[PDB]
């Protein structure tokens, strides 16, 4: 139908890529997947409670922490219910369900409890203590304000219903580049590799022929591998060395479990400055400039003491610890003892010779047991381990996705970005994970909204992965409901408008520190033009979907004084039932790859949760950040917060003569009462402690004081992770923060002891989750950090988390790092001034 011809055009402008376009495919995988995702989509769309879906309640089954129980020592929670002008508080029990509170209001002289200023609803059979918004207010000191109004109409959420034994051979015909002049002429060869998860089964090279705009070889390359022994997921990697220049991959076994046959003219990817993009089945879509390759395909006793100890020692080691042939052969001979240990699964599966039909068959016999694994307690770090680059077998990856299914939505939101990025390591487009991300995305609207923006960030930036993600985004968009589709349409239109403004203002400026009347007057009218008839009355905040934003506070909107020129935007809340007059502030910044900030902030949310398990609150501010396109995106504005450099440049001014007192003076200056300075010193102890631990672990500690911020309420925090991703420091700890602690160079004050206590308590709390942190880090680098990728680049986390060593040797190592910051004082800080200024 014609209505389906415009619907698809809506999906295309939403996705930012055309899913129907067959100009850059050599097979029907993407279309077959588009057709294959209709089943799991409808298996959720036509399976979800329309009432709870429309209301999207945010709940958690996790225990309320020791610190959050300290806020309610009276066993009573106060909730303020509002209708119009009337507002009366209720003495509610922590275990009281929304319905129990609904009747406790009717009795105290059809409707649903909606949050004030937020598109959030406190509904469903859950106690009020087990709500994320309630736990937020209890952590910040806010009162739980709610509106009495009718439930959201599920009719708005309607979905538009749709619908042998011979050795492997490869003939390398030749290579053709239209234009090569950039470097001095040398020789060239092709390296055809048969791989199954970063592991080469065999390698065959061509003879070196001279580098020309067309190099013909016509050589048949016979491999050591037989056609029967080729595993599903086997990826023929074609490489070019002058020393690597061009890579390309072809899935020897296809999506229908068929060996690839025929003539293929593959457009290859170049190298600029191991890597997730290096594994792509997708060809280069820019056929005019790219190098192509022409190829042709026509084809029961138990263990002794010391061995059990040897095996147990192997399972013990961190994910990064490599395995010798001895270790691998050990794991394999004692398969069944290794199967009895779930922590051995990532190591046992790396001991499989996948280029052996017989060994794979034995591996599949082991997977049939699964009893130990299926009954084992879910380990996210072990589940993620089996979903990485080192695992290409579908049935191996399925057991990880099987173990994932148990997660509550809250934990799905916790690991979403890392799971979204893990799709990059999948051999085929349609996968158990891709189907899992889709199911969960349609079951809840919060996962849905964030799944949309995560897929979109990569679609409008990655040529290597735009096509596959696009197929998964369409699948979601084709079942999210008319309302969400309407919402994303607004959001995108607004982001597109505001990115236009950002670049225009970036162009209308020269690198130097200026802020000339011309740029300020232009910015004023630029926004004024879009305010009147371009941007709608209300758009949803992508980083915080609870919040709806209205009109711009033009008089509050600015542009940075320095080289990057990002816009500082401010918006009024679209909700007239809001608790305050607090604006919605956004930063739009071009130059820095905000995908790197996203990953660091998502790990920061993880660390916070890990700390919660050992009842620690490190006052971290993982502010919202979404990458929208190439070297551009949004940043959430943390209210009434200033850079550390600005607090130093106020009393002093553009000098390295950093006076330690200025910081505490600012804290007492911005405090209305003495109690408000006491709460500010408390917030500073945790916030400084958390960010010291968090940064050192992630090896992003040595930072310039301009890239560290602080609030009027004492909460200190790190910023701009994109630009960072000799004399050195492990992290940031200078005498200015130390003065607030109460130390005059050499002192062990009551607040610096508190910091020293917390820091080791937090570092060890993260050591109880070593294998998880190591995986998330290893994955973060492979999927988000191009320059930060090699064996030695990933191996940083081991030394930082002090792998192998005891709690005593760990306690020592971290406090020694605090001392490195104390020995240096301001030496690396002044060095920043020589490079920056
Ligand atoms: C490079 C740069 C710069 C800034 C800010 C501090 N600087 C500005 C950004 C935009 C407009 C004006 C300024 C200003 O320098 O006053 C900045 N602010 C961030 N925010 C984190 C959340 O709290 C609000 C701040 C985050 C970030 O990555 N930033 C990066």
Swiss-Prot record:
Keywords: Angiogenesis, ATP-binding, Cell membrane, Chemotaxis, Cytoplasm, Disease variant, Endocytosis, Immunity, Inflammatory response, Kinase, Lipid metabolism, Membrane, Nucleotide-binding, Phosphoprotein, Serine/threonine-protein kinase, Transferase. Pathway: Phospholipid metabolism; phosphatidylinositol phosphate biosynthesis. Pancreas, skeletal muscle, liver and heart. Changing residue 589 to R: Loss of kinase activity. Loss of autophosphorylation. Reduced inflammatory reactions but no alterations in cardiac contractility. ATP binds at residues 585-594, 620-628, 717-725. Its EC number is 2.7.1.137, 2.7.1.153, 2.7.1.154, 2.7.11.1. SMART domains: PI3K_C2, PI3K_rbd, PI3Ka, PI3Kc. Residues 164-298 form the C2 PI3K-type domain. GO terms for biological process: adaptive immune response; angiogenesis; cell migration; cellular response to cAMP; dendritic cell chemotaxis; endocytosis; G protein-coupled receptor signaling pathway; hepatocyte apoptotic process. It catalyses: a 1,2-diacyl-sn-glycero-3-phospho-(1D-myo-inositol) + ATP = a 1,2-diacyl-sn-glycero-3-phospho-(1D-myo-inositol-3-phosphate) + ADP + H(+); a 1,2-diacyl-sn-glycero-3-phospho-(1D-myo-inositol-4,5-bisphosphate) + ATP = a 1,2-diacyl-sn-glycero-3-phospho-(1D-myo-inositol-3,4,5-trisphosphate) + ADP + H(+); a 1,2-diacyl-sn-glycero-3-phospho-(1D-myo-inositol 4-phosphate) + ATP = a 1,2-diacyl-sn-glycero-3-phospho-(1D-myo-inositol-3,4-bisphosphate) + ADP + H(+); L-seryl-[protein] + ATP = O-phospho-L-seryl-[protein] + ADP + H(+). Residues 300-479 form the PIK helical domain. Residues 74-150 form the PI3K-RBD domain. It is an enzyme of class 2 (transferase). Its main location: cytoplasm. Residues 718-734 are annotated as: Activation loop. InterPro entries: ARM-type_fold (IPR016024), C2_domain_sf (IPR035892), Kinase-like_dom_sf (IPR011009), PI3/4_kinase_cat_dom (IPR000403), PI3/4_kinase_cat_sf (IPR036940), PI3/4_kinase_CS (IPR018936), PI3K-type_C2_dom (IPR002420), PI3K_ABD (IPR003113). One of its GO terms (molecular function) is 1-phosphatidylinositol-4,5-bisphosphate 3-kinase activity. Belongs to the PI3/PI4-kinase family. Phosphoinositide-3-kinase (PI3K) that phosphorylates PtdIns(4,5)P2 (Phosphatidylinositol 4,5-bisphosphate) to generate phosphatidylinositol 3,4,5-trisphosphate (PIP3). PIP3 plays a key role by recruiting PH domain-containing proteins to the membrane, including AKT1 and PDPK1, activating signaling cascades involved in cell growth, survival, proliferation, motility and morphology. Links G-protein coupled receptor activation to PIP3 production. Involved in immune, inflammatory and allergic responses. Modulates leukocyte chemotaxis to inflammatory sites and in response to chemoattractant agents. This is Phosphatidylinositol 4,5-bisphosphate 3-kinase catalytic subunit gamma isoform. It comes from Homo sapiens (Human). The lineage of its organism: Eukaryota, Metazoa, Chordata, Craniata, Vertebrata. The gene is PIK3CG.
């Amino acid at each position: 139908s014609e209505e389906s011809q415009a619907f698809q055009r809506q999906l295309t402008a939403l996705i930012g890529y055309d899913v129907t376009d067959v100009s850059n495919v050599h097979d029907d995988e993407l279309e077959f997947t588009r057709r294959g995702l209709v089943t799991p989509r409808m298996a959720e769309v036509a399976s979800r409670d329309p009432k709870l879906y429309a209301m999207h309640p945010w709940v958690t089954s996790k225990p309320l922490p020791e610190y959050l129980w300290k806020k309610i020592a009276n066993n009573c929670i106060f909730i303020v219910i509002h209708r119009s002008t009337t507002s009366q508080t209720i003495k509610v029990s922590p275990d009281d369900t929304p319905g129990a509170i609904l009747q406790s209001f009717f009795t105290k002289m059809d409707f649903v409890l909606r949050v004030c200023g937020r598109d959030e609803y406190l509904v469903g059979e859950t106690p009020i203590k087990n709500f994320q918004w309630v736990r937020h207010c209890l952590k910040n000191g806010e009162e739980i304000h709610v509106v009495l109004d009718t439930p959201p109409d599920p009719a708005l959420d309607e979905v538009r219903k749709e619908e042998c034994d011979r050795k492997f051979r490869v003939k390398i015909r030749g290579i053709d580049i239209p234009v090569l002049p950039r470097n001095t002429d040398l020789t060239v060869f092709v390296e055809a590799n048969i791989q199954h998860g970063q592991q080469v089964l065999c390698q065959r090279r061509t003879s070196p022929k001279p580098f020309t705009e067309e190099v013909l070889w016509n050589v048949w390359l016979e491999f050591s591998i037989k056609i029967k022994d080729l595993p599903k997921g086997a990826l023929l990697n074609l490489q070019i060395y002058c020393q690597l220049l061009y890579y390309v991959n072809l899935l020897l076994i296809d999506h229908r479990f068929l060996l690839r046959r025929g003539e293929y003219v593959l457009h290859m990817w170049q190298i600029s400055g191991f890597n997730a993009d290096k594994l792509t089945s997708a060809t280069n879509p820019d056929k005019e400039n790219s190098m192509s390759i022409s190829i042709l395909l026509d084809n029961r006793a138990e263990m002794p003491n010391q061995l059990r100890k040897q095996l147990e020692a192997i399972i013990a080691t961190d994910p990064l610890n490599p395995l010798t042939a001895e270790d691998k052969e050990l794991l394999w001979h004692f398969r069944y003892e290794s199967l009895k240990h779930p922590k051995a699964y990532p190591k046992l599966f790396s001991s499989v010779k996948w280029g052996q039909q017989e060994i794979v068959a034995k591996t599949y016999q082991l997977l049939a047991r699964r009893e130990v694994w299926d009954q084992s307690a879910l380990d996210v770090g072990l589940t993620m381990q089996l979903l990485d680059c080192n695992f290409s077998d579908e049935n191996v990856r399925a057991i990880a996705v099987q173990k994932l299914e148990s997660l509550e939505d809250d934990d799905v939101l916790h690991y979403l970005l890392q799971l979204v990025q893990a799709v990059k390591f999948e051999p085929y487009h349609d996968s158990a994970l891709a189907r899992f991300l889709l199911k969960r995305g349609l079951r809840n609207k919060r996962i849905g909204h964030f799944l949309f923006w995560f897929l979109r960030s990569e679609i409008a930036q990655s040529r290597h992965y735009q096509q596959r993600f696009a197929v998964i985004l369409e699948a979601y968009l084709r079942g999210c409901g008319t309302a969400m589709l309407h919402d994303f349409t607004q959001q995108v239109q607004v982001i597109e408008m505001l990115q236009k403004v950002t670049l225009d203002i970036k162009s209308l400026s020269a690198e130097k520190y200026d802020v000339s009347s011309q740029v300020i007057s232009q910015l004023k009218q630029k926004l004024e033009n879009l305010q009147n008839s371009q941007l709608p009355e209300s758009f949803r905040v992508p980083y915080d979907p609870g919040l709806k934003a209205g009109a711009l506070a033009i008089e509050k909107c600015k542009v940075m004084a320095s080289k990057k020129k990002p816009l500082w935007l401010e918006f009024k809340c679209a909700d007239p039932t809001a608790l305050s007059n607090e604006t919605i502030g956004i930063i739009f910044k071009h130059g820095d790859d905000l995908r790197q900030d996203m990953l660091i902030l998502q790990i920061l949310r993880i660390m916070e949760s890990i700390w919660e398990t050992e009842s620690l609150d490190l006052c971290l501010l993982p502010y919202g950040c979404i990458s929208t396109g190439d070297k551009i995106g949004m940043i959430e504005i943390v209210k009434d917060a200033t850079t550390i450099a600005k607090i130093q440049q106020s009393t002093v001014g553009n000098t390295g003569a950093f006076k330690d007192e200025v910081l505490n003076h600012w804290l007492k200056e911005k405090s209305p009462t003495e109690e408000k300075f006491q709460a500010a010193v408390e917030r500073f102890v945790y916030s400084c402690a958390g960010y010291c631990v968090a940064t050192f672990v992630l090896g992003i500690g040595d930072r310039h004081n301009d890239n560290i911020m602080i609030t009027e309420t004492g909460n200190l925090f790190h910023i701009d992770f994109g630009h960072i991703l000799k004399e050195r420091v492990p992290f940031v700890l200078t005498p200015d923060f130390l003065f607030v602690m109460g130390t005059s160079g050499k002192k062990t004050s009551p607040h610096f002891q508190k910091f020293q206590d917390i820091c080791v308590k937090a570092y060890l709390a993260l050591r109880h989750h070593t294998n998880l942190l190591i995986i998330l880090f290893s994955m973060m680098l492979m999927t988000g950090m191009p320059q930060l990728t090699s064996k030695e680049d990933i191996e940083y986390i081991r030394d930082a988390l002090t792998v192998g060593k005891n709690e005593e040797d760990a306690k020592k190592y971290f406090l020694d790092q605090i001392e490195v910051c104390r020995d240096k004082g301001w030496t690396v800080q002044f060095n920043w001034f020589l490079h920056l200024v």
